[PDB]
């Protein structure tokens, strides 16, 4: 019932592309408000 | 287990009807997470499965009487051809699978 | 030291079975819980996987629901026969039908009145289509191991006629493909095949010879 | 009808060059012919004008410090000059960003500044908003 | 009103827009003379695919109210620059824009993904010269897949009709 | 089938008792608690 | 359970039914065992859940409280409901307006007629005692059956005795299964069409149908189901359908209530019920194959034997509600059934009803209508119409004549000994 044709769809690159995609959505989330944060870091360094 | 495909002719032991049963590809347990105890006994049972299901209690379901039981008897195909070719065509309808005229 | 611990656990088990501390539902933690209801006792019972493999009954794909309602008390002389057929059909084929069809939701009710006529309600995937309500009609020359299969045939042909009566199937098709999983509450004891999921799903795989 | 795929005719020619190239060609062919008309800005331009001040604005951005790698942020409301900036930023290869001005606050402005990290900000003083 | 009074002076033989601001023209076009629109012949409205399907009676209303020869409706996702398929007033069929291929595929492939059955919801892939596979983000310039066959991922799921028609959807959430 | 592992043997046992005592696996035996209505509809 | 079909303007009063522990519930178990007869009725009511506690939301003005009074074999629950209900009524006496108290004559006649009633009151009470000693059996279980008879237990015992009176159990559920609601509705419309020419409007108003929705405990709402009524509630719908019916009726209680008594007592009769009788299938169209369309005669006989019994308590309990001072000390002392239904009707309406019942019973007894095979006979209905019209046209014109009728036909209706 579960047989596949001979020219069979690829799982490897679909995997690599989707999990990579996942990583860059995560990057899009993590980078929100980055410049202000990186502004305060220098002030904390100067204070310390 | 199991690396290769194989076809068997089994007899339902309650009603004595012959149906055919196939065994397909299931992959080896992962070589990278390695288990000797899995792989090796899987190998011996693989050899066993290849020879007429020698040490295996066969469990399937009758089509002509629908129930799952292990009464099944595995027949090598010469015993099958001995069983089949001596039959009248109307009892091929009862005992055997569709067509097989 | 496995054997004696095993023994220990068995005696322990029977002790809790005499004294009512034993929870039969622990393997089932991840499943949703069926309807606690007067007819649905076919749901809470743990089904062997083998006799689910035995009863493989498929109806038309355009069936979304099967309800079986039957009266608790039957005033009528023949009322009992009808109720018994309905009860037997509700216990034998309701869970299997659900199991294999998986879009069909199946529910049986014990409704408390003296009424001799049990009925079966079939819903199709059309919202706009009226459900078909089939009566249970035991013939007085038919016993309860035969009439039940007759009712099964009636339900199958009823679902089939209900599904071939559907205004354009494009809609029904996409609704079918997107209808969520209805057989989740079913509790199955996988006996002699529990070891990996692939033979848990073993009833899905079908060998097609002579293509 | 049978399968889900749809295709258009391929006989139509495809233009693969840069934008500035077609601007130069169209400026050589019809030089004095009108290109765009705006009454509220008093802008009547030929293809002469669009070529001339497109690359002029390009040089303007080059001396204002823009380079082929970086970005421009533009909040201009329906002017001719946002198009001119399209062409200019096309000529020096800088990515132009056009954001809608109809809902604009300080917070989302600094979001755009966080996102694109532009070299330039093309802005107004008084902008008309509904 | 100042808009009409300008466009009737400027001698525009045809103009572009979207439904939502043609609403305002339809409010205030009745106040003027019919023959003032005599230069306008065709008009264009652009459609994002999540609109779906500006009704043709509205197009008929436009054409009768402005004295128009033909009303052109273009439709496509925003990646495609609002043109994938298009129709006229007189032709209800959705003709594809030339050099455009729209396919709906399965989930198990990238290049080698297979076309679905023409009603089934699956991924959408657009191949065309005016289609863009890049998009800018917080992270920077980003790109989704352009494969060996030349097609391009939109990360959108769609349903194709029997008659040429695309319907976009959100991602499948079961 | 001679089991070389204990779990193999409980598999063997399970199919065995599915075969020999099959009265265990009929639906009336599954329903021992309901030969009647639900248990809460009774008397004391 | 004593007065069916009497209705009044009412406000919804929430009452938490019981106290129970989620792990171990005595309440739910005992009820589910004893409450079967209308199960859907227990299923429909809201379930209010609190930490380690369960409660059910009750509407006192609804027939639900009456159902609890009838079908609960638990003493303490029905006692809590009884005492709290009486307390609620007595507390409402201050907030509520003064009773109408229509005429001193009716009060005098009722007073003089009520005195003789207690001999057979002791008979029926000790009958409830004999029924309570035997109340513990295989069918019904009670906590203490030997425990003293109280004012809270009356309805339950009444049910026990009526079920014992019926030769076939359970006639209630059988007859319910046979009788459809819409059928009796339409045939009551036919009854109105035949009995009164071009009268009684068309159908009940939205207020009245919503009231009857609050006046009836509904049935299984599932797919392919027709609503059915217990014989008692059939009598209830039957008389409540007669008061609100008449269009040309002027405003007077007695005249228009007489129709109520007439249609109630019409629902009591076996022949009418069997004439209206259908199965669920014939009305629903599910099964065209049925051996008998009409209710079995035995069930009808039983159902009729049910509603007739306990005339004395039926009289006295309602007699308590004639006046609020009569209702003040007789709630605790005198045998009665506390009902939020008759509270708003207290003074004029309850008394006028008390007279109307007797005046209709006179017709019933003197005509011997109970055994009539065809109740739809023309002459019969004509005489009925003229009768109700006359009795209606009397008391407004001449009161003392109607007083005489009430008293004499009271000596007739409830036998002395
Ligand atoms: Zn067999």
Short mmCIF file of N, CA and C and ligand atoms in Angstrom, two decimals, chain B residues 12 15 17 62 65, ligand 1:
data_model
loop_
_atom_site.label_atom_id
_atom_site.label_comp_id
_atom_site.label_asym_id
_atom_site.label_seq_id
_atom_site.Cartn_x
_atom_site.Cartn_y
_atom_site.Cartn_z
N UNK B 12 -4.87 -22.20 5.80
CA UNK B 12 -5.66 -22.00 6.99
C UNK B 12 -6.06 -23.32 7.59
N UNK B 15 -10.27 -24.30 8.45
CA UNK B 15 -11.11 -24.60 7.29
C UNK B 15 -10.38 -25.20 6.09
N UNK B 17 -8.24 -23.75 3.81
CA UNK B 17 -8.22 -22.94 2.60
C UNK B 17 -6.85 -22.31 2.42
N UNK B 62 -7.51 -15.63 8.46
CA UNK B 62 -8.21 -16.28 7.35
C UNK B 62 -9.08 -15.27 6.62
N UNK B 65 -12.61 -17.55 6.45
CA UNK B 65 -13.27 -17.40 7.73
C UNK B 65 -12.57 -16.25 8.44
ZN1 LIG H 1 -9.99 -20.62 7.80
#
